[PDB]
């Protein structure tokens, strides 16, 4: 996260760490039930970079605060049972449908530091996914095109589709939204390397619940003026989310 600040203890209890058993941080992820994690498909599979992670290559770490300490009595580390990538994920061109589900080997237990986020309903999505409304991104990724000791947080505004489209050469799809301040706004912030797969969440003003609207997906550089971070559009892919859980868990 660039230009963010340290998270408060238990501020994002659905935040998950995708950890490689070299033992390294792969990406964030989010807890949506006691047995299901949501992440970016490219975190697992990106053939151009020769990245094709399997169930047995990874570990999921939940309830974490610190990036590197093993937080004895606080975090829980699970083994994956199965990985599901969106059948139409487009890794050949624009990371369209950049989403995967990971089913845990065993249901995790909730605690002050471990709690699931909600998935939006069409109507939550309809009223919140508006240009100018702010969401929150979290992760342990680079600070700079450079690493925090603890979880970072940043609040960012959703930007109008045309503005998104006109900032890049990549072609944008209905399955993506972009967020960030405009050069004029004199407020910065962005996700960065290592943040991928993390949650873009919003707090509903109707029921005071936190909803995951987006997934950290792609961008070009970090916190560049006139550029914006791009996220997977969770609601547009919810059908696929349901399904898998239903057809399998």
């Amino acid at each position: 996260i660039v230009e963010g600040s340290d998270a408060e203890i238990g501020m994002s209890p659905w935040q998950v760490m995708l950890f490689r058993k070299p033992q390294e941080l792969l990406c964030g992820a989010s807890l949506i039930s006691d047995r299901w994690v949501l992440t970016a498909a490219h975190c697992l599979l990106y053939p151009p970079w020769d990245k094709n992670f399997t169930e047995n290559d990874l570990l999921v770490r939940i309830g974490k605060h610190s990036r590197t300490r093993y937080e004895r009595n606080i975090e829980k580390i699970s083994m994956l049972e199965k990985i599901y990538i969106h059948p139409r994920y487009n890794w050949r061109e624009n990371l369209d449908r950049d989403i995967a589900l990971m089913k845990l080997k065993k249901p995790v237990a909730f605690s002050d530091y471990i709690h699931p986020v909600c998935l939006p309903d069409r109507e939550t999505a309809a009223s919140l996914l508006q240009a100018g409304y702010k969401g929150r991104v979290t992760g342990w990724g680079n600070l700079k095109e450079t690493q925090p000791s603890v979880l970072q947080v940043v609040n960012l505004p959703i930007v109008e589709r045309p503005v998104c489209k006109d900032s890049t050469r990549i072609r944008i799809t209905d399955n993506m939204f972009c967020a960030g301040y405009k050069p004029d706004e004199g407020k910065r912030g962005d996700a960065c390397e290592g943040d991928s797969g993390g949650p873009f969440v919003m707090k509903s003003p109707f029921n005071n619940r936190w909803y995951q609207m987006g997934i950290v997906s792609w961008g070009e550089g970090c916190d560049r003026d006139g550029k914006y971070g791009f996220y997977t559009h969770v609601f547009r892919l919810k059908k696929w989310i349901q399904k898998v859980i239903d057809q399998f868990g």
Binding site: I9, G10, P13, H115, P116, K134, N155, N208, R209
Partner: peptide, 26 residues
């Protein structure tokens, strides 16, 4: 069910230090 209600914030009626910034934008 209990989704999105944080044990240390919502469940205790405490606010995190920047959540008003979100609500204020809506």
């Amino acid at each position: 069910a209990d989704c999105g209600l944080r044990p240390l914030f919502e469940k205790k009626s405490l606010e995190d230090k920047t959540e008003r910034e979100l609500l204020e934008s809506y």
